[PDB]
Design a protein around this ligand. Structure first.
Ligand SMILES: CC(C)(COP(=O)(O)OP(=O)(O)OC[C@H]1O[C@@H](n2cnc3c(N)ncnc32)[C@H](O)[C@@H]1OP(=O)(O)O)[C@@H](O)C(=O)NCCC(=O)NCCS
Ligand SMILES: CC(C)(COP(=O)(O)OP(=O)(O)OC[C@H]1O[C@@H](n2cnc3c(N)ncnc32)[C@H](O)[C@@H]1OP(=O)(O)O)[C@@H](O)C(=O)NCCC(=O)NCCS
Ligand SMILES: [Cl-]
Ligand SMILES: [Cl-]
Ligand SMILES: [Cl-]
Ligand code: NA
Ligand code: NA
Ligand code: NA
Lengths: 389, 389, 389, 389
């Protein structure tokens, strides 16, 4: 009975690019202000802000609260961060919906934010090391991208999936080129304008307005993609080219009850019909969207064939193809404006990022039934079904 | 509707003490197994694990999933971490309750875990430091204990409260000594044995079993307390002695519907009858427990006088006294076995820690109505009402 | 008794520019191999290699030796480094003379080398910080630029000299601009070609050849100068345009005796008759080149007016205008082709750097007596006595 | 032609111990003014202060000047630091002697200072660390203990010499134990009293006067030294027992022409009759003193058998045992009062340390021609012969 009244995201920045020195909570504050403004809802009406964020080390106490306060959400509201890895920004929306469903809140802003650029290096130095070198650990790699059980990068899990579903390097590269070309086309045609709220990077040497997804490559060629070296295995197939990137961004949705939207005269972007999260083997985490989507659709009472549009996260070409083959949905309704291989993947924000892309595309094409889904390090998936009002 | 089938916590370790080299997820795994065993529930029946944790930097991907996996919870279940600062371990239980309430899970393990000892120092080093000094930042201080808006320590917010409510150094010291003596009495009498599950610390030359709260001072004197210097303000009143400590521990609860418990023939520790979270001014965050407790009681349909037992967190004597004065509950029913000044406060575990202490004491004395509440950095409170079955 | 038979120096690289990744000893190595076949002595006849270096930290065991063994000098030879800061580069050549003077060596390779670019940040960490941030200190700034007695930048002492000699922002900028014009002129006219030896900066994807000082700005106008802001004093006069730069480079000279060279038919580049160093108030270190330049003359039996050429370190336009507004030697023969404001100042190398010009110049313009002087931190100055044949 | 007027060293300290938190220069401060007052010469007569130091990172500009100044050396005087690794403190002495032989000074305080304890960790971060884990080094290990050419520790080059000279595990112990015996013996006797100048370690909470060497062990036997596990090769022979320690200290001497001391009516400890230096195969740096001492011996026109007393640093038992067996000098007059392994070897000071042991002992018993020799990292040697009338 819970609708998404509005949504917004920042453009997605390149690693150490547009948002190289912008803390996640600043990106988050801008998206909170935006969902309020887009819905006609004042910050004083917000009850809670819930923001997925995987890499908050060094940012200060509870960045979700910092983002909310900066956006002018009242001190009497509350805010909290959560971490279900790449599933975070979508899971936060489900959690927000549950606040309203249980009657504990009326208006929630939910999503995710991440500054992978700003993630620090670290070391536990309270014990001591009285002689010889020690390791400074990249928190982004360690806490974001390394499997805690097997010790290897998410990219190895992508190889595991490639080997298992027998996906060639050529098939992976074709998929990646296709994502870029879809994203370039959508960007040129203006299809990211609605969802994107511009972010002003404040600087001594001048303010810069960032309103374009900077990671999207224009004129992606299969030839250059085919020449890349495997990035995780000497004899592997996964490359920097057919993998998603490291990125900065934030994304969110304003939630409230359908009844509440009606009183306000709001035309919402959609009704949250169902959601699900399910676990899989950590060695093939990329497959998590399969059981999660199946579970979400079961809960919705929907067949796979009932879906009009799908956003299925593109962590790696390997798993994205695996998911598409197993679920068997029409690939032409999946990521119709491109995916994370082209647009980028700020971890904590990603699931809210693809939700934004889904909502605004559903509205533009008049799609009735949609699904957003992501894989999750450590072996999970999450998925949400949305229906137009 | 939703009951706490069972609960457990580790003993609380001193800073760089018994758990000095023990990752939070190891403490968490032990408590997960404990709640399963105590309820007679198998790890394969668990749907999701939800663990508050403020300081996970460097521990690797999603430590909640690391703990769950260690405990033998199946790969098909899910897990995530959350952060509402000191409120986390309690908020996690409410969030788990909501999973069951909305019909999305049946069996949830929820709580918190924190290794403040293992928290690393960090620095953002990606853009390179062109020239001039830069800090290695203590993540425990920066992300757990410093206000992000005013830039000062939680201990300064404690002074703000002391000033506002005119709480003398002598009043705060008496409160601190009283906490220590109650904890010492309860520890000697065996009142922590039920809630504590022992933790085996693995070591080269010998394994050590930890089953006692090692922060509790034995024989604490008013005289020594009065001799301490203000830790945050030269003209202050808040000291190491009347403040809670830096600590390591985990704590959790196993949740299911009342009907599920009945089916299993489980005698639950209590029914979750309501919960609330509310914001206050960050400068006086210690006051969060007032509006949060008031809201939780309203939702339960309870008067303050209806409560038989209360656990109100003791981040600092100043704020605990403020909360007590304002709410006006009989202090003889609050923190009857001592509080965090004596027992310690591993940040993300604290809310579940005091929940454990509340539940096992309610069972012991046959108290029908209880309430747990904590203050939260950045100006929040959380509270939960529990009734015996 | 002693002569300098040949000299050679690297181009001067800007901060984090052409040699941003190039270790000092590498630049020293090229500099030795340059001077070493310039006379007719093979590396295998070199006794010792004496190199001035100020920021050796993290580059490995005794760099002087790394730069020699790599330069080709045999293992039976010997090498060490020294540190009179900005004076090291010339004191080094002087130290070289004493060896062949005392009759303990025959052929010495002596000068300076520095990669301020490569200077690390450090922190004493054997204690194991129990809690709280700790500083990462910029060694370049701390051990290379900060007064150990007053804790302020050398630039502050330049203000002390300025205030002392009443050198208006105008006269400093007027000295400065003059430097950039002379430096830019000498470069175009290739008057830096003889001395400069190419250094090949090796690269993974191709090698670059650096044979030109990249720090000289193409003719700074007295107007562009008047733009800049005070660099060290809120209401000061010392700017980033009239002060020295931060630089990387290397420079040295081969030293040997008269009769021995006679045997080998070797033609010198200058004679060594004496040398001097003297200390001043550290608060006004820039005055160093005044007593030093005056005591050198004495032991040479020469009067101030006997010299036909002079190079005088431009650490700052302020300390520079004063050094000249006192000593009296022909003002227009100071820094025939500039010094440091435009060319650069890699600390340890500075002396031998400003020497190379001098040495070769005495041989190209043909003059009986020449001299170079430099200011030294902690309040000192240094110089030698050369007499081409 | 030039003499040591007076000689003073500090108490040699253990790693992280007596001078755990004391800076090199504060050790060099009492040492210089120790010799000054021993000679009866005013600090204002000091011409120059030359002190060897290998690990100065983070201590500030030119710590050799920091020592002079703190010991009351006038600003008008001169000072610099230098580095020839394990031979910094003795090579200084000759460089000192050579300040006067050329006639550029009359009075130099020359020596060495080192606080290996205070040597920091570091990294080059100016360019940044774009992604992935990295190392903070050690400077003591990387800059003072590891080869720059083969990349291995001194404890390995000492291993090279073992097998090369078929030195078993027994032949190495016997030396360390016999030197751990004569150190405890010479200690109780008090033959260290004279050469030690007491250092006052300022303790905010307990002031303590260090006046004895704390790396000397009491009751050394071939029994304990034999139960040690190889520390540089599982099946090695070099241990913590038959190798020098890591240590802090400073040491120096007052030099003046023999004519200048006559005018001052001072009894000179000795008279520097010959010195030298030359390199040996780097793999066997320990083989530095063999050829070094030989030049010392020929330059002085002295047969080996002319000597009466010898100080050869026992950085490792492997090298020393070859210093004796290969050279010739009767092993019964070499380090009679024990050596490094027992005493200690604070790199930069160690060369000024052994000399002070040499001088006061030649005095005490009556030795005319005595020699002091050290090995050097990089494969070099340095030695100095000192006869007193
Ligand atoms: C895969 C990854 C390690 C690559 O990072 P990287 O090693 O720094 O690789 P880069 O981004 O620098 O790319 C290397 C080269 O490939 C090139 N490249 C990348 N994509 C390309 C394309 N489509 N066409 C042509 N060239 C391409 C880049 O231009 C770069 O060129 P350069 O060496 O001249 O600069 C990193 O992006 C990553 O880890 N992504 C993982 C995302 C993830 O795991 N998300 C969560 C999983 S659940
Ligand atoms: C208060 C705090 C800063 C103290 O840190 P610390 O002083 O560096 O470390 P300690 O409290 O262990 O040490 C305090 C000193 O007082 C002494 N002390 C502490 N409690 C004492 C008591 N009850 N009686 C007598 N002496 C006592 C200790 O022995 C120690 O003595 P010492 O310095 O002479 O050896 C630290 O515990 C803290 O930051 N707590 C924060 C809790 C918090 O902010 N929660 C946030 C709520 S949202
Ligand atoms: Cl009690
Ligand atoms: Cl360091
Ligand atoms: Cl060397
Ligand atoms: Na040279
Ligand atoms: Na350098
Ligand atoms: Na030897």
């Amino acid at each position: 009975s819970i609708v998404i009244a509005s949504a917004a995201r920042t453009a997605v920045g390149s690693f150490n690019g547009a948002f190289a020195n912008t803390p996640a909570h600043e990106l988050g504050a801008t998206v909170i202000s935006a969902v309020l403004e887009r819905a006609g809802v004042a910050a004083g009406e917000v009850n809670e802000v819930i923001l997925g964020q995987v890499l908050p080390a060094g940012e200060g106490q509870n960045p979700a609260r910092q983002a909310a306060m900066k956006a002018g959400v009242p001190q009497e509201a509350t805010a909290w961060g959560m971490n279900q890895l790449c599933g975070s920004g979508l899971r936060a929306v489900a959690l927000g919906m549950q606040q309203i469903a249980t009657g504990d809140a009326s208006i929630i802003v939910a999503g995710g934010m991440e500054s992978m650029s700003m993630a620090p290096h670290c070391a536990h130095l309270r014990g001591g090391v009285k002689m010889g070198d020690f390791k400074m650990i990249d928190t982004m790699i360690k806490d974001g991208l390394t499997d805690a059980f097997y010790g290897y990068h998410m990219g190895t899990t992508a190889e595991n999936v490639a080997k298992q579903w027998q996906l060639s390097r050529d098939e992976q590269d074709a998929f990646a080129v296709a994502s870029q070309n879809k994203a370039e086309a959508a960007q040129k045609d203006g299809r990211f304008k609605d969802e994107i709220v511009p972010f002003i990077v404040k600087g001594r040497k001048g303010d810069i307005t960032v309103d374009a997804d900077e990671y999207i490559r224009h004129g992606a060629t299969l030839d250059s993609m085919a020449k890349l070296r495997p990035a995780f295995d000497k004899e592997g197939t996964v490359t920097a080219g057919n993998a998603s990137g490291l990125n900065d961004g934030a994304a969110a949705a304003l939630l409230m009850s359908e009844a509440e939207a009606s009183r306000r005269g709001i035309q919402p972007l959609g009704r949250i019909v169902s959601w699900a999260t399910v676990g899989v083997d950590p060695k093939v985490m990329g497959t998590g969207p399969i059981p999660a989507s199946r579970k979400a659709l079961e809960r919705a009472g929907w067949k796979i064939g009932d879906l009009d549009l799908v956003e299925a996260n593109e962590a790696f070409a390997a798993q994205a193809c695996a998911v598409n083959k197993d679920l068997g949905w029409d690939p032409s309704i999946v990521n119709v404006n491109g995916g994370a291989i082209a647009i980028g993947a700020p971890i904590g924000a990603s699931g809210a990022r693809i939700l934004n892309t889904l909502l605004f595309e559903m509205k533009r094409r008049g799609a009735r039934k949609g699904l957003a889904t992501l894989c999750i390090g450590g072996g999970m998936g999450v998925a949400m079904c949305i229906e137009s009002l």
